[PDB]
Symmetry: D2
Subunit: 331 residues, 4 copies
């Protein structure tokens, strides 16, 4: 008779089943910043970790396990076999090649498409009803790719997209204005990358259009060069990579934000990568970022943002660049 | 008049001063895991970061700043010069060489005692009233070293100590019992390293003594071999380092735990390294982990744990091993 | 072509089903305090309220809804019909004829039983797989009553019991010691209220047994009179009732603590009311507060606390008296 | 020696001074909802309660104290004497007469102006440097009165104002739209009362002006009748009071959202009661709700919303009925 049976009288034997489980595959910098942010936001009762490097995977899992006393996620599991993934409400894909100093996120597509062909079919086998949240770059195209490979309805295949870019916009907005970013509003849409589109017309504080006040806003005739805010937004990740090697913390927070709206059916509005064929005169299966209502079934709605002539061209230009790569993708 | 003046009528001047400022020294794996845990627990209205590598520091700072939207810490600052550190309530020192595969934490002492000769005087110049939270290894020695250099009273000089070791002990205990670590109680005291002491006396669930239910507990005669749990506690950091190269997440959550007790004046009990000369017949200025009440003034009080004759022996030895290095210390 | 249709493009048809729904029955001071505490702990994606007073019900629900902007609970609903309760994971019963300002918790049992005979089968009808958390006094008797009417297995019928008495115990302990109740350990078990049992043997700080350090602990000879800490555990409840009319905040936080372990499957140990037949010499179907492991299936396990004969006599005296009332009841 | 001495070795004696202390004056329905919200958001290390009913005051203090275990505010005190208020960082004034069914909030001005002449000087005495957060109705006028009696700079005298009303507006707006209020944007300004102003022009989702989508918005010709949302906002408090007797939960969350911005120096923008003399052609010492930036020093900045001609008329009308009551104010 163990110390345990002398101490604990058991009322029910080996019966479980996970209720709010999250999986992250890829325990690199992004994957672990997603994990830690999701754990400290109390979003999962189970967190499963997958990667192809078996020792780093076990070490990252053990490290998190050792801080369980400070957490409210009672089960953390890992392995190279996707059976540890079974019955995930949400699966976050951060595995892949990240970019070099100066490297376009688009240049990583074939290398990442090549590992999505193994990851995506396996994620679906053990979690057929999950929402798929793609973070690996180029995020817009790999969401499209994950949607094609999985067979999932498009509402359940979501891309990181421009939640981060818009967060960066709002941080820079608040910096200029001496206001917290929560009370600074402005949206960066389209490709999470060089061709992203700032929607100047919807930029506002407490409901007052900055464009209306300051008509030159977002143009080259602008004496204050607010165009430079969206420039910093584009260039920010290149700067961070150059400075520290890679970005991780912000995207982890960004992904935790999306997880939270999904895991908790909040029906909040985020700009995420979704299939936009049909709007602004795009006739192809292009994925890019528009504001979407996120909840327990993924994307249930899209906000039809009205754009100026020029904004619409910029957004279609972004879709043209994107679809060109999608066209000759092979998988 | 700028777009900002049309938007915002200003009433107030320049009145700053941080009220709940925390500084982290060193933005490596451990420093940044501390930063992220403190930001997600809202312990601070201002976080400052310092490191000798300007590069890395600016990039970590920016990465954090890009996530401000998802946080409630309105100022993240950094710099090579410790004037960004001014008026911190809590300075967390994580700078320094870490251990290689198999290397003892004690083998780092001279390398990091050298780093501390530059860091500590700079820290105290700009925050004379701060609490010092030492993380760099060997944490027991460097807390002594940091107290000798600073001139601070012992209550404001704190080593992270055995808070992590106990969190690891509780975790494995709960792993054996099927109970959450929050409800499994056991203390690992002394050196945060190979000579730590597990207090079988006060190992309990719901207030029932495990030792009493099982007098062989923590004994070579023990058929359940519980002392293996403490062996896994000693061995765990080495195993994590062997698996992933370092450790970060659990110590980051362990620091935030201690920061929270300190920042919120909770007077919770933690096993932290402090000056224990006077207790258990230790007549030298040895620092090591004993249970302490932590609040707005650092360590205000000590819990005089009742020790077996043997546990007292192992702890008195843990001291001797530690004082062995302390006496031969030059700075 | 509504504004909504202009602004939003829909993707998902009917959709929905609450995933982590909680129901509170009874919206007096207690039921509403549970409600606000669960809401502020982000415990449910849907909160349902039910009572017989339709006016107060709609108004309490509306008051909560007007605060939705500051919450992370997207659906708040209420009704006299239990259809609003469908698919609750947890249902908290606070309804009653609130036990008179003075008399214990017995002369009115049957009146509350008649209320349960209406409430319980409606609850079970729309959420046959829920856990049931009973707060109504007398909690130990009415938890038994909910078990009889519901037909639920015992693991799924949990009385609030002595979680709150113990919480009061650890507050009073920490006030004496100058330590946060979080780090003050001690258990009050048995009948919630007048006959509750303070297990002096488990009272410890940081693993140090206060009874062993201080043998007079719990005796009437005790020059420090630690007996009085438990007397105040009982009488302070009366004092608050006498002072403000009733209690609410403390019990509300307690219930949300239990809800937290349950909804998040933490497997923390709490002293709640469970069918205790087969332990400490008790042979009648009775519920008493025992340390219990709470998780997604309710009470899965139970800690068998070593008790003195003296202590054990009180539990069986309490079990004797409870079962006596129970066989006179009509239901 | 005592058991406390045998257990705890004391290092520091001297210790005292709260750093993030909050006082609530008035422990009625509102005040308690305020305290409990503040407690569960961990905004304070010291909470002080004040009232004139010594029984109700003590029982609420104790009821809160019994939940200490579940909280992170280690000091909860109360007294009829204001020395317990000493050195509060924020004082929240909720005492006074509330409105019976149908009663206008302005009809409480004389009774409550009398109560302030007692409270405010006592408060100012013991916390000369504190922020004053006024909730007592009529909140706009009583904020003026508090400011007059106190002699504080106008940045440190804030009325809860239309934070609650705008929250209600965004709840109703989201309800019609199928979107969380966090993502629904709209401002109700001016008097917290019958004459509040909805700024239709800034109502938006993801920066899409709804007035531009639906130019009949807010107009009587609007055949979707959106101006019924503002009517509901005006009437909501009358309906809730008719239904449950009073409002408490939503205002407590509103006050907690304001306290958070203040105690954490977030510089979020909230619509609160401030002095608007000189704006929108208002030449008197009128206090009503405009978008303010809230932080550690109270209101540091004001947002100049572009009001349409009708909207500007409505706002000056709202100010002139406020002034006619202020004008006739003897004190
Ligand atoms: N959408 C956004 O805003 C962000 C996108 N990213 C992208 O995330 C991806 C990963 O970034 P990092 O974490 O910094 O790289 P990393 O090199 O630190 O980690 C990537 C991990 O993926 C694992 N991996 C490679 N192939 C795998 C496969 N078939 N299956 C499972 N795991 C596999 C690797 O072992 C590695 O641990 C990159 O594409 C990066 O560009 C990075 C920053 C944020
Ligand atoms: N007490 C505990 O439980 C644990 C302590 N540690 C110790 O923390 C320390 C750091 O570990 P890691 O973050 O992984 O190392 P790391 O290599 O990732 O980062 C160390 C940082 O310190 C900086 N550094 C070196 N000399 C400096 C100097 N004079 N001034 C300012 N910065 C300087 C470095 O630039 C680097 O950014 C080590 O001593 C490690 O042993 C690590 C894990 C747990
Ligand atoms: N377990 C514990 O630690 C404590 C238990 N309690 C008990 O909780 C219960 C509630 O206490 P209070 O809210 O303060 O009293 P209360 O009388 O204000 O609330 C009881 C509510 O249940 C409603 N009710 C009566 N019959 C109902 C029925 N068929 N269906 C739905 N609702 C019905 C009533 O309308 C009332 O709103 C009482 O029995 C009290 O003795 C109170 C505090 C401590
Ligand atoms: N601005 C807003 O949105 C909100 C404003 N209110 C207002 O809050 C105020 C109170 O509402 P309730 O709490 O429901 O009323 P209540 O009657 O439940 O409690 C009011 C408390 O103020 C106490 N009091 C009277 N004179 C006092 C004095 N010199 N010093 C200290 N305490 C004193 C009373 O004893 C009572 O405890 C009213 O003016 C109400 O209209 C109510 C809801 C929200």
């Amino acid at each position: 008779a163990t110390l345990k049976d002398q101490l604990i009288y058991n009322l029910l034997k080996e019966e479980q089943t996970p209720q709010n489980k999250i999986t992250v595959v890829g325990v690199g910098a992004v994957g672990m910043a997603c994990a830690i942010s999701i754990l400290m936001k109390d979003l999962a009762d189970e967190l499963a970790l997958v990667d192809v490097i078996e020792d780093k995977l076990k070490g990252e899992m053990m490290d998190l396990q050792h801080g369980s006393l400070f957490l409210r996620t009672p089960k953390i599991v890992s392995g190279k076999d996707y059976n540890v993934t079974a019955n995930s409400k949400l699966v976050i894909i951060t595995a892949g090649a990240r970019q070099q100093e100066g490297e376009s996120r688009l240049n990583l597509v074939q290398r990442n498409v090549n590992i999505f062909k193994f990851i995506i079919p396996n994620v679906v086998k053990y979690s057929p009803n999950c929402k798929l949240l793609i973070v690996s770059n180029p995020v817009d195209i790999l969401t499209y790719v994950a949607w094609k490979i999985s067979g999932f309805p498009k509402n359940r295949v979501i891309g990181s997209g421009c939640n981060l870019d818009s967060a960066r916009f709002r941080y820079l907005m608040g910096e200029r204005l001496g206001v917290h970013p929560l009370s600074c509003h402005g949206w960066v849409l389209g490709e999470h990358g060089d061709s992203s589109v700032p929607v100047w017309s919807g930029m506002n504080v407490a409901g007052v259009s900055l464009k209306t006040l300051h008509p030159d806003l977002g143009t080259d005739k602008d004496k204050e060069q607010w165009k430079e805010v969206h420039k910093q937004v584009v260039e920010s990740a290149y700067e961070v990579i150059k400075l520290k090697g890679y970005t991780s913390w912000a995207i982890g927070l960004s992904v935790a934000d999306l997880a939270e709206s999904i895991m908790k059916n909040l029906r909040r509005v985020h700009p995420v990568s979704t299939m936009i064929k049909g709007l602004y005169g795009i006739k192809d299966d292009v994925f890019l970022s528009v504001p979407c209502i996120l909840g327990q079934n993924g994307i249930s709605d899209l906000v039809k943002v009205t754009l100026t002539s020029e904004e619409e061209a910029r957004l279609k230009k972004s879709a043209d660049t994107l679809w060109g790569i999608q066209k000759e993708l092979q998988f």
